[PDB]
Amino acid sequence: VYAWNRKRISNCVADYSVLYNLAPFFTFKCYGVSPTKLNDLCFTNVYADS
Amino acid sequence: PTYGVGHQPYRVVVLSFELLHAPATVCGPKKSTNLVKNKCVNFNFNGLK
Amino acid sequence: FVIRGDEVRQIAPGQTGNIADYNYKLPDDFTGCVIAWNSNKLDSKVSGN
Amino acid sequence: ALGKLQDVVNHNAQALNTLVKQLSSKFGAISSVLNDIFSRLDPPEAEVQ
């Protein structure tokens, strides 16, 4: 929580299916979107952070 | 190695997206069809439904 | 029906997964109750049930 | 001179220009386009916004 490893993704066909078969308890909780319709849309720039 | 569940570590990754009408680059896996010129149809150009 | 532990959260009306999409899916109108409990005392045997 | 007959035209014109501006003004939702709210939400919650 002291350093944010922010890494934006570039132009690609991001398939939201690898996160399904992730580590145990792979809950896909969202706060404004829905995972059911979070794979059929395009994104300007997605920012990742661990 | 055997810490209590109340104080176990959690690896959490958030994916903040930009849900805007800007020209997007990170699209989802889908298919593509042909284009009609003078036929009223349902379009989904770059997310715009 | 009998499922695992981390898959009980998919019995709610509307969810993704493997059992909530191809094994047993509930509509988004279910006005009822879901009852589940740990059955590892009599439904878990040696070398796999 | 022809202001009393032009004000009724402007009143019937400024009243229609406010409906086309309130059409793209969110009244407590995530966006103003109805085709985008149903595109990134679930009907459990999509019917709320």
UniProtKB/Swiss-Prot annotation, chain B:
**Which residue stretches belong to region Disordered?**
21-43
Q: What does changing H21P do?
A: Increased resistance to human covalescent sera neutralization
Q: What does this protein do?
A: Attaches the virion to the cell membrane by interacting with host receptor, initiating the infection. The major receptor is host ACE2. When S2/S2' has been cleaved, binding to the receptor triggers direct fusion at the cell membrane. When S2/S2' has not been cleaved, binding to the receptor results in internalization of the virus by endocytosis using host TFRC and GRM2 and leading to fusion of the virion membrane with the host endosomal membrane. Alternatively, may use NRP1/NRP2 and integrin as entry receptors.
Oligomeric form and interacting partners = Binds to host ACE2. RBD also interacts with the N-linked glycan on 'Asn-90' of ACE2. Cleavage of S generates a polybasic C-terminal sequence on S1 that binds to host Neuropilin-1 (NRP1) and Neuropilin-2 (NRP2) receptors. Interacts with host integrin alpha-5/beta-1 (ITGA5:ITGB1) and with ACE2 in complex with integrin alpha-5/beta-1 (ITGA5:ITGB1). May interact via cytoplasmic c-terminus with M protein. May interact (via N-terminus) with host bilirubin and biliverdin, thereby preventing antibody binding to the SARS-CoV-2 spike NTD via an allosteric mechanism.
The identity of this protein, by name, is Spike protein S1
Q: Provide the species name.
A: Severe acute respiratory syndrome coronavirus 2
